[PDB]
Structure 1
Amino acid sequence: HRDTQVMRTYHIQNREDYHKYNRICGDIRRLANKLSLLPPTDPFRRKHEQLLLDKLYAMGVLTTKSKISDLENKVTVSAICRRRLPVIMHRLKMAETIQDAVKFIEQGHVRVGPNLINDPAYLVTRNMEDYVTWVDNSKIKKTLLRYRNQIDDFDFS
């Protein structure tokens, strides 16, 4: 029951979410394997996984882009399941717990740039990880500003 055991730690909608990642996280390694079977001094192969580690680090599933061994060993579903939006709202200390962040996404208090986001299971790029905020004029961004005694209703915060 590894699929359930990580559905709890990150709070997932459907128990099938895990194996929806673990099909991708396996598909990384199958492309890693056949790209390991090409000869090492091939300017395709040298170009092609560094082309891929650019993307898998921008998305942020893997910690570094130097170690080439991470691509088979550290690519786990729990790695890709913590660039989920409610985990990121718990990493950035927005909500208190990780269930409570799903409660705030589903009610509609969080946003990415212009548009608010409503699927809890929004993957967030490490580049896009800068831009999550509380949605403006919300009743939960109004309460935060009352704690510091710094509301400003010309913003109608």
Structure 2
Amino acid sequence: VRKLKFHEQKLLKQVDFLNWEVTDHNLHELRVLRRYRLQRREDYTRYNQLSRAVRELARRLRDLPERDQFRVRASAALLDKLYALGLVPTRGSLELCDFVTASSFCRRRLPTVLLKLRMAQHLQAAVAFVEQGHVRVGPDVVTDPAFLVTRSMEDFVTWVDSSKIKRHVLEYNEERDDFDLEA
């Protein structure tokens, strides 16, 4: 607690209460939680453990002979699922399958996709909008921030109708119609 003296530091070396990197890896985890707002630590664990399963499958598939029908069919099946969710940039080789992390799952959540589509500029603002029922994926309205959006479904995230934020957007563009909006 107090600044240790020169003689005290030698005997009390490696003693630090707040930072335990080997045990819980909290400092590394904290950067992930803050960068992509995660309500619960448990959600990060499920992403991390699932990421290991994807990587473990790829390393095992590599060990199989290159000229094997089982490997080729499994490799094509694995990459098309990952590409559909948006975890892998292109449907290339299995080398791209090794780059997936728990952060890859976080980048596919609805609040951060809202950020990329420029509907919101701030991540806490993006989480606020879904929790207050202003964003819909198709006719259905999504309230849960933990919601991985598919690339195909990404085209159809938009403001729910009869919402104040949509009124502000239309008012700025000089396209505000009382008949269509409020109805």
How far is the alpha carbon of 1:16 from its aligned partner?
Answer: 2.2
Which of 98, 102, 118 is equivalent to 2:143? 118
Report if the CA contact (8 A) 2:108-2:149 is conserved: yes
Which of 3, 6, 15 is equivalent to 2:41? 15
- In structure 2, the CA distance between the partners of 1:14 and 1:107, relative to structure 1 (3 Å rule), is same
1:64 aligns with 2:90: yes
Q: Which residue of the partner structure matches residue 32 of structure 2?
A: 6
1:36 aligns with 2:49: no
- Aligned length, in residue pairs: 156
User: Deviation string for 1:94-143 (max 9, x for gaps)?
Assistant: 11211100000001100000100010111001111101000011111111
Using the size of structure 1 for normalisation, the TM-score is: 0.95
Q: Which residue of the partner structure matches residue 144 of structure 1?
A: 169
SS across alignment from 2:179: coil
1:54 aligns with 2:80: yes
Instruction: Write the distance in 2 (CA, Å) between the matches of 1:125 and 1:23.
Output: 21
Structure 1 residues not aligned, in runs of 5+: none
Using the size of structure 2 for normalisation, the TM-score is: 0.82
SS across alignment from 1:111: strand
Larger Rg: 2
Q: Which residue of the partner structure matches residue 103 of structure 2?
A: 78
User: Deviation string for 1:50-87 (max 9, x for gaps)?
Assistant: 11111100100111111321111x20111221011000
1:90 aligns with 2:127: no
Identity over aligned pairs, percent: 50
User: Deviation string for 1:10-46 (max 9, x for gaps)?
Assistant: 1111122212100111110111122122211111110
Instruction: Write the distance in 1 (CA, Å) between the matches of 2:103 and 2:32.
Output: 7
Report if the CA contact (8 A) 2:58-2:97 is conserved: yes
Q: What is the root-mean-square deviation in Å for CA atoms of aligned residues?
A: 1.1
Instruction: Write the distance in 2 (CA, Å) between the matches of 1:123 and 1:139.
Output: 25
Structure 2 residues not aligned, in runs of 5+: 1-26
SS across alignment from 2:158: strand
Aligned partner letter, 2:39:
Q
How far is the alpha carbon of 1:154 from its aligned partner?
Answer: 1.8
Instruction: Write the distance in 1 (CA, Å) between the matches of 2:47 and 2:173.
Output: 40
